[PDB]
Amino acid sequence: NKMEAKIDELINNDPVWSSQNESLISKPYNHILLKNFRLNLIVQINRVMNLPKDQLAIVSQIVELLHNSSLLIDDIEDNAPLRRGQTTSHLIFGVPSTINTANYMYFRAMQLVSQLTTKEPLYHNLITIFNEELINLHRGQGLDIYWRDFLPEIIPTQEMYLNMVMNKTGGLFRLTLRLMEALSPSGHSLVPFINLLGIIYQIRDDYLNLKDFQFAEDITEGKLSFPIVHALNFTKTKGQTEQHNEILRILLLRTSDKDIKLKLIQILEFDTNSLAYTKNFINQLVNMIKND
Amino acid sequence: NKMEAKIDELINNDPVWSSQNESLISKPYNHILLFRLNLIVQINRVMNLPKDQLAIVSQIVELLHNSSLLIDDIEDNAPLRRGQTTSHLIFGVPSTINTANYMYFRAMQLVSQLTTKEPLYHNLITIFNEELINLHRGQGLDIYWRDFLPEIIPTQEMYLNMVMNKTGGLFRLTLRLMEALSPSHSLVPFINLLGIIYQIRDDYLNLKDFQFAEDITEGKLSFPIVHALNFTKTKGQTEQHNEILRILLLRTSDKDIKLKLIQILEFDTNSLAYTKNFINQLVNMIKNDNENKYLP
Ligand SMILES: CC(C)=CCC/C(C)=C/CC(C/C=C(\C)CCC=C(C)C)(P(=O)(O)O)P(=O)(O)O
Ligand SMILES: CC(C)=CCC/C(C)=C/CC(C/C=C(\C)CCC=C(C)C)(P(=O)(O)O)P(=O)(O)O
Ligand SMILES: [Mg+2]
Ligand SMILES: [Mg+2]
Ligand SMILES: [Mg+2]
Ligand SMILES: [Mg+2]
């Protein structure tokens, strides 16, 4: 009877969640917070969208949660040891807590959308954009991960890699902009532009990762970067069998040996000219804007 | 010129995605597909959702359920899920995490297809939202206790609230959606008690079937363990309290060491007996529910 009442009380109330609990399970996330330029893009874009700063704040909050959560997970998936010159959360708090916290923040983010409007028609568009771009994000990420973890099952071509980027990187970039375009109280859609900004961003990330070495973690990962994809297809094309295989073998070692990583890079520098190709590819993309 | 052409085309289109791609990413989910729908069908008798809108609800629930099992096995370092090899051991942790999270959002998208009524949608999303949030909190606490042991040893109360969040999330989600779509007293209190019977029973059966008892290997703060731990602390049984902690902290597969911890629960604290009793009472709260305060 006393137990029965304590239970009766329980099952008839909402589940209990204290602020301490909230603090406890937010450790992996608070860690990565300690790591502005994401708001510079939002403030600029806004110069054109004209959103009241009240709503722009809630937009900035949604994107950061989604962004920081993405990084918490991408690090697990990529077995990354450092993020922004700091130990990654999964190495401190563990993979289990990090996955849960990150996925949890995805839903806190989703919850904040209610705060952008009272308008039922608008709200629905918002949730849809939120849904679509998150679905796109996971698709690209699924390919980048599949290609990597199952190499050499599939050697992506420049086209396949770019579709993957349109999904993955474009995902976050389109989410931010598409949401603002729906809240804008006010020319043409800036989506095409943000997609190009996303592609340039990703290929420059892939590129600087190797040039900054020449610590090239992307090689330790086995990632099918823009430079590696060109090297692999170039090599198959010109009949360079041993080079094509050494590239695959090195990617598959998941090595942190600096000399082995340097060898690979010099292969992309003198043998396949992938570094130059990529540099040019980036410049051309930028020129497409600068010459618009 | 020609490169400019292709890029232009690319950025002016939706991201490309074929079904072959869809198949790649689904592999980890398909692997886990290889009684619940009966419970949903049964519940509809009072809800009366049109066999079709009910299929969708059913699909949403299945995506979520199956997806959380894939993530939970990664978090629990489980080598087996119903006799077969767990997905992350076959497809790796990265793809499995991603495929499971992708499915969460596919589930979130099916919600838009239950209704086209603007208020009713906002209420379905809210429900979906709230329950997924409660589910992650319960899981977060469950993992936290397990991974920070012995910083915090939960009490029966703490444990049960963790269950209301975790196990209650997936049970309530299903029920609150159905009740909201119903064309026809809430059964949420009843689903809550159910979830609790189910979880305490899950923890109970895990040890009893052995008497592989993976929960021990996992180091989990299961219901019998929570009892044992607070039972020895109360009776001041120092060694035994520490011995229980020591075994959980071993993350062992040692059949012999697992046996010992169980020996402790059976002989020293009688936690297993205490739990069998607990379950029964909860059920009687339902069995002896005359006037149907909980039952329909
Ligand atoms: C977890 C899921 C589905 C997706 C996660 C996708 C992400 C963020 C991956 C992280 C990497 C690329 C960085 C990006 C895209 C930052 C974008 C910045 C904005 C300001 C939008 P990195 O590790 O940081 O180099 P990647 O090299 O692994 O491609
Ligand atoms: C991934 C996130 C946030 C939450 C996941 C929560 C889950 C599913 C945990 C799995 C376990 C409990 C079993 C359940 C819930 C049976 C399926 C439920 C139905 C309602 C049919 P188990 O491993 O199967 O014993 P647990 O013992 O680890 O608590
Ligand atoms: Mg990465
Ligand atoms: Mg990556
Ligand atoms: Mg589990
Ligand atoms: Mg678990």
XYZ file of C-alpha atoms and ligand atoms in Angstrom:
650
model
C 0.000 0.000 0.000
C 2.795 2.485 0.685
C 4.837 1.155 -2.233
C 1.694 1.005 -4.346
C 1.089 4.692 -3.563
C 4.668 5.704 -4.271
C 4.363 3.924 -7.637
C 0.911 5.274 -8.301
C 2.400 8.728 -7.764
C 5.269 7.974 -10.140
C 3.389 6.521 -13.086
C 0.926 9.426 -12.938
C 3.505 12.174 -13.084
C 5.994 13.203 -15.767
C 9.366 11.618 -15.552
C 11.614 13.257 -12.955
C 14.703 15.085 -14.221
C 16.785 17.374 -12.027
C 19.157 20.152 -13.111
C 22.018 18.144 -11.634
C 21.132 15.295 -13.971
C 21.098 17.825 -16.816
C 24.553 19.008 -15.763
C 25.846 15.451 -15.426
C 24.939 14.383 -18.906
C 26.113 17.609 -20.537
C 29.792 17.136 -19.754
C 30.894 15.905 -23.225
C 29.129 18.853 -24.814
C 30.377 21.548 -22.396
C 33.848 20.291 -23.113
C 33.754 21.052 -26.811
C 32.188 24.468 -26.194
C 35.573 25.591 -24.832
C 36.889 25.401 -28.426
C 32.488 33.096 -33.303
C 33.208 32.638 -36.988
C 30.017 30.579 -37.218
C 28.166 33.744 -36.109
C 30.040 36.004 -38.516
C 28.531 34.079 -41.422
C 25.094 34.296 -39.773
C 25.369 38.050 -39.145
C 26.479 38.654 -42.731
C 23.881 36.479 -44.347
C 21.409 38.355 -42.172
C 22.473 41.684 -43.613
C 20.478 40.323 -46.547
C 17.761 38.339 -44.758
C 16.839 41.046 -42.187
C 15.811 38.868 -39.229
C 15.042 40.530 -35.893
C 18.017 39.821 -33.625
C 15.655 38.076 -31.217
C 15.008 35.305 -33.753
C 18.570 35.395 -35.105
C 19.806 34.400 -31.660
C 17.599 31.311 -31.582
C 18.854 30.486 -35.075
C 22.457 30.822 -33.942
C 21.698 28.534 -30.970
C 20.150 25.790 -33.073
C 23.013 25.707 -35.524
C 25.696 25.653 -32.794
C 24.050 22.741 -30.998
C 23.698 20.888 -34.256
C 27.239 21.817 -35.181
C 28.958 21.031 -31.898
C 27.019 17.784 -31.650
C 28.114 16.819 -35.166
C 31.715 17.376 -34.164
C 31.337 15.289 -31.017
C 30.146 12.400 -33.169
C 32.351 12.884 -36.205
C 35.253 12.577 -33.823
C 34.109 9.203 -32.547
C 33.497 8.035 -36.118
C 36.916 9.254 -37.295
C 38.777 8.104 -34.161
C 40.139 11.661 -33.733
C 42.412 12.330 -30.749
C 42.349 16.142 -30.809
C 39.825 18.768 -31.856
C 40.878 22.415 -31.767
C 44.124 21.669 -29.898
C 42.262 19.836 -27.114
C 41.480 16.200 -26.305
C 38.253 15.053 -27.941
C 35.367 14.415 -25.547
C 35.037 10.686 -26.217
C 38.555 10.166 -24.897
C 37.764 11.898 -21.601
C 34.170 10.938 -20.853
C 34.018 7.837 -23.024
C 32.299 6.888 -26.282
C 29.052 5.835 -24.643
C 28.401 9.162 -22.854
C 29.633 11.134 -25.828
C 27.251 9.464 -28.291
C 24.277 9.881 -25.991
C 24.977 13.537 -25.194
C 25.515 14.476 -28.802
C 22.339 12.714 -29.970
C 20.544 14.338 -27.035
C 21.593 17.830 -28.107
C 20.172 17.043 -31.583
C 16.770 16.887 -29.970
C 17.286 19.918 -27.732
C 18.083 21.704 -30.961
C 14.913 20.370 -32.577
C 12.988 21.544 -29.509
C 14.138 25.186 -29.898
C 12.472 25.472 -33.306
C 9.192 25.993 -31.464
C 10.672 29.276 -30.331
C 11.002 30.813 -33.761
C 7.299 31.364 -34.410
C 3.755 30.814 -33.259
C 2.633 30.488 -36.895
C 1.628 26.874 -37.537
C 2.272 27.057 -41.332
C 5.723 28.577 -40.823
C 6.658 26.237 -37.971
C 5.993 23.254 -40.228
C 8.224 24.595 -42.947
C 10.932 25.093 -40.359
C 10.734 21.537 -38.957
C 10.773 20.226 -42.526
C 13.918 22.193 -43.407
C 15.430 20.945 -40.116
C 14.456 17.395 -41.032
C 15.615 17.481 -44.671
C 19.029 18.984 -44.017
C 19.690 16.577 -41.149
C 18.699 13.682 -43.416
C 21.076 15.058 -46.030
C 23.837 15.429 -43.466
C 23.636 11.774 -42.406
C 23.601 10.535 -45.990
C 26.851 12.211 -46.958
C 28.484 11.204 -43.702
C 27.322 7.613 -44.295
C 29.075 7.556 -47.669
C 32.280 9.195 -46.509
C 32.375 6.625 -43.686
C 31.442 3.659 -45.908
C 34.021 4.492 -48.543
C 36.650 4.801 -45.831
C 35.890 1.784 -43.742
C 35.441 -0.533 -46.721
C 38.174 0.630 -49.009
C 38.907 -0.636 -51.590
C 35.318 -1.848 -52.124
C 34.502 1.464 -53.746
C 36.916 4.048 -55.194
C 34.710 7.190 -55.500
C 35.162 9.401 -58.568
C 35.365 13.201 -58.477
C 31.637 13.245 -59.192
C 30.658 10.839 -56.446
C 32.821 12.709 -53.907
C 31.140 15.981 -54.813
C 27.675 14.543 -54.375
C 28.784 13.297 -51.000
C 29.956 16.829 -50.117
C 26.697 18.362 -51.356
C 24.962 16.109 -48.824
C 27.364 16.316 -45.866
C 28.861 19.799 -45.845
C 26.044 21.353 -47.843
C 23.764 19.866 -45.218
C 24.799 22.249 -42.434
C 25.312 25.227 -44.681
C 21.853 24.821 -46.283
C 20.154 24.311 -42.956
C 21.326 27.657 -41.604
C 20.459 29.589 -44.751
C 17.204 27.812 -45.599
C 15.883 28.546 -42.072
C 16.723 32.219 -42.392
C 15.110 32.445 -45.817
C 11.845 31.264 -44.249
C 11.975 33.749 -41.400
C 13.084 36.595 -43.609
C 10.429 39.323 -43.444
C 11.585 40.555 -46.870
C 16.326 38.640 -54.515
C 17.194 35.133 -55.731
C 17.727 32.199 -53.342
C 21.200 32.113 -51.843
C 21.182 28.315 -51.664
C 23.294 27.872 -54.840
C 25.871 30.197 -53.358
C 25.952 28.465 -49.971
C 26.339 25.099 -51.713
C 29.411 26.424 -53.524
C 30.688 27.848 -50.245
C 30.233 24.378 -48.732
C 32.129 22.614 -51.486
C 35.014 25.123 -51.400
C 35.123 24.752 -47.592
C 35.368 20.953 -47.667
C 38.019 20.694 -50.387
C 40.094 23.393 -48.653
C 39.785 21.412 -45.345
C 40.924 18.266 -47.162
C 43.737 20.215 -48.836
C 45.138 22.236 -45.952
C 45.189 19.051 -43.866
C 47.994 17.721 -46.134
C 49.702 20.969 -47.153
C 50.022 22.083 -43.504
C 52.097 18.971 -42.894
C 54.265 19.196 -45.997
C 49.740 16.632 -38.618
C 47.786 15.106 -41.546
C 45.256 13.185 -39.419
C 43.205 12.690 -42.580
C 45.784 10.157 -43.676
C 45.758 8.367 -40.337
C 41.968 8.082 -40.844
C 42.009 6.663 -44.367
C 39.654 9.405 -45.471
C 38.827 9.585 -49.183
C 39.717 13.267 -49.432
C 39.434 15.325 -52.652
C 43.250 15.008 -53.128
C 43.215 11.230 -52.535
C 40.255 10.674 -54.922
C 42.079 12.454 -57.719
C 45.264 10.513 -56.972
C 43.404 7.215 -57.014
C 41.501 7.829 -60.250
C 44.510 9.477 -61.936
C 46.630 6.407 -61.061
C 44.053 3.904 -62.309
C 43.663 5.946 -65.490
C 47.329 6.287 -66.396
C 48.017 2.634 -65.609
C 50.162 3.322 -62.519
C 49.379 0.106 -60.682
C 51.991 0.130 -57.948
C 51.313 3.759 -57.072
C 47.530 3.102 -56.952
C 48.171 0.223 -54.578
C 50.659 1.961 -52.324
C 48.094 4.717 -51.912
C 45.482 2.093 -50.875
C 47.916 0.274 -48.600
C 48.953 3.437 -46.799
C 45.366 4.578 -46.321
C 44.631 1.136 -44.887
C 47.485 1.207 -42.373
C 45.773 3.877 -40.208
C 49.324 4.858 -39.414
C 50.610 7.827 -37.441
C 54.147 7.341 -38.732
C 55.232 10.822 -39.965
C 57.552 9.450 -42.613
C 54.927 7.140 -44.048
C 52.449 10.029 -44.150
C 55.059 12.274 -45.778
C 55.754 9.641 -48.475
C 52.076 9.492 -49.399
C 51.855 13.255 -49.657
C 54.931 13.466 -51.887
C 53.275 10.855 -54.068
C 50.324 13.255 -54.437
C 52.832 16.089 -55.036
C 55.225 14.699 -57.680
C 53.645 11.482 -58.945
C 49.963 12.342 -59.390
C 50.117 16.131 -59.030
C 47.000 15.879 -56.863
C 48.037 18.734 -54.588
C 48.407 21.097 -57.548
C 45.220 19.823 -59.153
C 43.296 20.500 -55.962
C 44.811 23.928 -55.442
C 43.742 24.899 -58.913
C 40.332 23.306 -58.435
C 39.862 25.476 -55.382
C 40.976 28.677 -57.120
C 38.651 28.055 -60.031
C 35.760 27.634 -57.604
C 36.607 30.878 -55.845
C 36.963 32.626 -59.173
C 33.433 31.480 -59.958
C 32.321 33.782 -57.180
C 34.860 36.580 -57.505
C 33.957 36.620 -61.204
C 30.155 36.554 -60.825
C 34.195 26.546 -69.017
C 33.400 22.822 -68.856
C 34.254 22.523 -65.183
C 32.305 25.709 -64.513
C 29.383 24.035 -66.287
C 29.216 20.934 -64.085
C 29.660 22.873 -60.854
C 26.854 25.248 -61.811
C 24.583 22.306 -62.465
C 25.560 20.709 -59.167
C 24.902 23.675 -56.914
C 21.621 24.434 -58.622
C 20.263 21.035 -57.791
C 19.238 19.120 -54.720
C 22.015 16.927 -53.425
C 22.175 13.753 -55.532
C 21.207 10.488 -53.789
C 20.436 7.150 -55.456
C 18.822 4.074 -53.957
C 22.081 2.137 -54.257
C 23.371 4.787 -51.820
C 20.277 4.288 -49.638
C 21.112 0.581 -49.593
C 24.678 1.141 -48.490
C 23.671 3.208 -45.515
C 20.861 0.815 -44.546
C 23.001 -2.290 -44.281
C 23.512 -1.862 -40.486
C 19.815 -1.350 -39.928
C 18.754 -4.213 -42.165
C 21.026 -6.499 -40.246
C 19.033 -6.005 -37.018
C 15.648 -6.623 -38.641
C 16.463 -10.324 -39.102
C 5.035 -9.290 -30.912
C 5.322 -5.518 -30.564
C 3.058 -4.840 -33.557
C 0.602 -7.143 -31.811
C 0.595 -4.870 -28.770
C 0.003 -1.866 -31.052
C -2.796 -3.610 -32.918
C -4.349 -4.576 -29.615
C -4.194 -1.015 -28.251
C -5.922 0.342 -31.342
C -9.170 -1.361 -30.260
C -9.630 1.589 -27.935
C -7.923 4.094 -30.193
C -9.461 3.108 -33.513
C -6.882 4.513 -35.871
C -7.516 3.593 -39.514
C -5.453 0.507 -40.447
C -2.919 2.531 -42.474
C -2.310 5.499 -40.239
C -1.609 2.693 -37.783
C 0.957 1.157 -40.128
C 2.867 4.440 -40.176
C 2.841 4.829 -36.379
C 3.998 1.260 -36.380
C 6.883 2.086 -38.740
C 7.946 5.112 -36.714
C 8.075 3.067 -33.546
C 9.995 0.293 -35.254
C 12.636 2.646 -36.680
C 13.181 4.220 -33.277
C 13.184 0.976 -31.366
C 15.563 -0.793 -33.736
C 17.823 2.270 -34.022
C 18.165 2.687 -30.264
C 19.088 -0.996 -30.005
C 21.961 -0.472 -32.476
C 23.208 2.547 -30.490
C 22.635 0.853 -27.125
C 24.704 -2.152 -28.189
C 27.583 0.139 -29.070
C 27.222 1.908 -25.698
C 26.968 -1.417 -23.862
C 29.769 -3.065 -25.830
C 27.448 -5.998 -26.640
C 28.770 -8.814 -28.867
C 25.313 -10.301 -29.367
C 21.730 -9.178 -29.978
C 19.309 -12.125 -29.953
C 21.856 -14.792 -30.762
C 23.322 -13.136 -33.818
C 26.377 -10.906 -34.062
C 25.669 -7.218 -33.229
C 25.824 -4.816 -36.204
C 28.778 -2.675 -35.009
C 30.924 -5.768 -34.888
C 30.096 -6.493 -38.523
C 29.839 -2.973 -39.978
C 31.992 -1.064 -37.493
C 31.012 1.533 -34.866
C 31.106 4.545 -37.261
C 28.649 3.312 -39.864
C 26.384 1.847 -37.214
C 26.186 5.075 -35.254
C 25.491 6.993 -38.401
C 22.881 4.582 -39.782
C 21.033 4.506 -36.438
C 20.992 8.318 -36.210
C 19.924 8.550 -39.834
C 16.934 6.361 -38.984
C 15.935 8.608 -36.090
C 15.404 11.366 -38.646
C 13.643 9.060 -41.090
C 11.313 8.326 -38.224
C 10.980 12.046 -37.579
C 9.952 12.447 -41.218
C 7.210 9.806 -41.109
C 5.564 11.907 -38.408
C 4.666 14.476 -41.054
C 2.618 11.789 -42.790
C 0.259 10.926 -39.963
C -1.781 14.091 -40.473
C -2.029 17.298 -42.472
C -3.922 19.179 -39.774
C -1.633 22.051 -38.653
C -2.365 21.920 -34.917
C -2.305 18.090 -34.719
C 1.108 18.045 -36.403
C 2.660 20.445 -33.926
C 1.341 18.184 -31.199
C 2.707 15.027 -32.825
C 6.153 16.539 -33.265
C 6.077 17.822 -29.704
C 5.235 14.324 -28.457
C 7.922 12.742 -30.644
C 10.329 15.397 -29.504
C 9.578 15.132 -25.758
C 9.775 11.371 -25.626
C 13.034 11.155 -27.558
C 14.461 13.743 -25.187
C 13.296 11.744 -22.134
C 14.744 8.623 -23.697
C 18.175 10.165 -24.035
C 18.118 11.509 -20.466
C 17.334 8.113 -19.007
C 20.046 6.550 -21.118
C 22.456 9.288 -20.181
C 21.896 8.716 -16.492
C 22.029 4.937 -16.861
C 25.418 5.199 -18.643
C 26.701 7.839 -16.304
C 26.085 5.728 -13.209
C 27.741 2.787 -14.919
C 30.776 4.667 -16.168
C 31.422 6.824 -13.096
C 30.940 3.963 -10.644
C 31.562 4.196 -7.839
C 31.254 7.987 -7.693
C 27.441 7.672 -7.387
C 25.467 4.687 -6.204
C 21.825 5.232 -7.114
C 18.934 4.468 -4.769
C 15.720 2.636 -5.725
C 14.020 5.995 -6.222
C 16.789 7.333 -8.448
C 16.767 4.075 -10.422
C 13.004 4.156 -11.009
C 13.119 7.733 -12.236
C 15.858 6.801 -14.633
C 13.518 4.053 -15.917
C 10.582 6.476 -16.257
C 12.770 8.529 -18.570
C 14.482 5.724 -20.524
C 12.043 2.805 -20.785
C 9.121 5.199 -20.400
C 10.131 7.225 -23.419
C 9.574 4.558 -26.064
C 6.407 3.224 -24.415
C 4.834 6.658 -23.923
C 5.826 7.848 -27.380
C 3.778 5.086 -28.950
C 0.857 5.644 -26.648
C 0.773 9.419 -26.793
C 0.834 9.437 -30.570
C -1.986 6.899 -30.817
C -4.078 8.765 -28.248
C -3.538 12.012 -30.136
C -4.548 10.527 -33.505
C -7.537 8.703 -32.039
C -10.781 9.546 -33.854
C -12.832 8.034 -31.000
C -9.148 7.698 -19.209
C -5.645 8.074 -20.686
C -3.544 4.917 -20.691
C -0.263 6.758 -20.130
C -0.170 5.826 -16.423
C -0.687 2.227 -17.449
C 2.049 2.340 -20.100
C 4.448 3.836 -17.523
C 3.895 0.959 -15.073
C 4.314 -1.406 -17.976
C 7.668 0.041 -18.985
C 8.799 -0.344 -15.396
C 7.681 -3.964 -15.167
C 9.441 -4.571 -18.458
C 12.737 -2.957 -17.393
C 12.949 -4.394 -13.934
C 12.094 -7.761 -15.501
C 14.806 -7.298 -18.201
C 17.409 -6.772 -15.434
C 15.949 -9.607 -13.395
C 15.905 -12.165 -16.219
C 19.480 -11.297 -17.230
C 20.907 -12.765 -13.998
C 18.287 -15.490 -13.447
C 18.719 -17.117 -16.886
C 22.403 -17.563 -16.042
C 21.764 -18.937 -12.541
C 25.520 -15.164 -19.912
C 24.525 -12.338 -17.519
C 26.116 -9.686 -19.736
C 24.755 -6.977 -17.419
C 27.421 -7.944 -14.900
C 30.107 -7.883 -17.566
C 28.703 -4.495 -18.591
C 28.923 -3.268 -14.977
C 25.356 -1.940 -15.081
C 23.442 -0.546 -12.114
C 20.636 -3.073 -12.622
C 17.648 -3.172 -10.244
C 18.989 -6.121 -8.237
C 22.400 -4.486 -7.975
C 20.874 -1.226 -6.797
C 19.111 -3.230 -4.109
C 22.209 -5.199 -3.116
C 24.351 -2.051 -2.955
C 21.936 -0.140 -0.713
C 21.163 -3.274 1.342
C 24.798 -3.821 2.363
C 25.353 -0.118 2.958
C 22.344 -0.059 5.308
C 23.241 -3.248 7.200
C 26.802 -1.908 7.230
C 28.213 -4.971 5.451
C 31.443 -3.301 4.357
C 33.261 -6.164 2.600
C 30.222 -7.379 0.706
C 29.408 -3.858 -0.437
C 32.920 -3.457 -1.730
C 32.984 -6.927 -3.224
C 29.909 -6.175 -5.355
C 31.557 -2.977 -6.567
C 34.788 -4.808 -7.301
C 33.125 -7.315 -9.562
C 31.092 -4.765 -11.512
C 34.297 -2.771 -11.950
C 36.059 -5.752 -13.460
C 33.928 -5.681 -16.618
C 34.444 -9.466 -16.517
C 33.319 -12.369 -18.705
C 34.692 -14.802 -16.149
C 31.868 -17.288 -15.655
C 33.173 -18.071 -12.173
C 33.382 -14.468 -11.055
C 29.891 -13.808 -12.419
C 28.638 -16.732 -10.355
C 30.143 -15.281 -7.170
C 28.444 -11.889 -7.512
C 25.208 -13.758 -8.008
C 26.016 -15.918 -4.997
C 26.240 -12.682 -3.052
C 22.857 -11.463 -4.275
C 21.168 -14.807 -3.625
C 22.626 -15.546 -0.175
C 23.774 -12.288 1.353
C 21.242 -9.635 0.279
C 18.589 -11.857 -1.328
C 18.273 -9.147 -3.953
C 17.071 -11.576 -6.621
C 14.261 -12.635 -4.279
C 13.560 -9.020 -3.467
C 13.211 -8.261 -7.189
C 10.930 -11.211 -7.979
C 8.713 -9.805 -5.229
C 8.867 -6.273 -6.553
C 7.806 -7.356 -10.076
C 4.869 -9.416 -8.720
C 3.486 -6.525 -6.685
C 3.602 -4.197 -9.697
C 1.696 -6.781 -11.670
C -0.909 -7.172 -8.915
C -1.410 -3.411 -9.110
C -2.764 -4.381 -12.524
C -4.133 -7.868 -11.813
C -6.163 -6.610 -8.869
C -7.183 -3.428 -10.708
C -10.896 -3.633 -10.141
C -12.760 -0.521 -11.273
C -10.042 -0.086 -13.899
C -8.116 2.967 -12.722
C -5.200 1.788 -14.844
C -6.842 -0.695 -17.178
C -9.169 0.410 -19.991
C 27.971 13.662 -37.613
C 27.523 13.987 -39.039
C 26.264 13.325 -39.606
C 28.241 14.885 -39.820
C 29.390 15.573 -39.449
C 30.078 16.257 -40.633
C 31.277 17.039 -40.096
C 31.019 18.354 -39.358
C 32.578 16.583 -40.283
C 33.710 17.220 -39.789
C 34.893 17.438 -40.737
C 34.585 18.554 -41.738
C 34.235 19.746 -41.113
C 33.039 20.440 -41.258
C 31.942 19.918 -42.188
C 32.833 21.743 -40.482
C 31.741 22.615 -41.108
C 31.744 23.878 -40.525
C 30.704 24.801 -40.518
C 30.886 26.154 -39.827
C 29.374 24.456 -41.193
P 36.346 17.845 -39.643
O 36.645 16.514 -38.795
O 36.052 18.998 -38.766
O 37.610 18.095 -40.608
P 35.323 15.932 -41.750
O 36.863 16.151 -42.161
O 35.118 14.663 -41.018
O 34.503 16.043 -43.129
C 19.896 4.485 -27.364
C 18.994 5.073 -26.275
C 18.940 6.587 -26.075
C 18.224 4.229 -25.479
C 18.193 2.842 -25.583
C 17.373 2.156 -24.488
C 17.389 0.653 -24.775
C 16.545 0.103 -25.927
C 18.152 -0.218 -24.008
C 18.237 -1.585 -24.243
C 18.132 -2.504 -23.025
C 16.700 -2.531 -22.486
C 15.829 -3.225 -23.317
C 14.748 -2.702 -24.017
C 14.419 -1.211 -23.913
C 13.903 -3.646 -24.879
C 13.262 -2.970 -26.094
C 12.273 -2.057 -25.744
C 10.952 -2.044 -26.181
C 10.007 -0.948 -25.688
C 10.422 -3.117 -27.135
P 18.687 -4.195 -23.575
O 20.244 -4.059 -23.953
O 17.868 -4.662 -24.715
O 18.604 -5.163 -22.291
P 19.234 -1.992 -21.615
O 19.245 -3.298 -20.677
O 20.597 -1.610 -22.045
O 18.436 -0.843 -20.818
Mg 36.332 14.539 -39.384
Mg 34.837 12.413 -41.229
Mg 21.789 -2.448 -23.520
Mg 21.979 0.013 -21.753
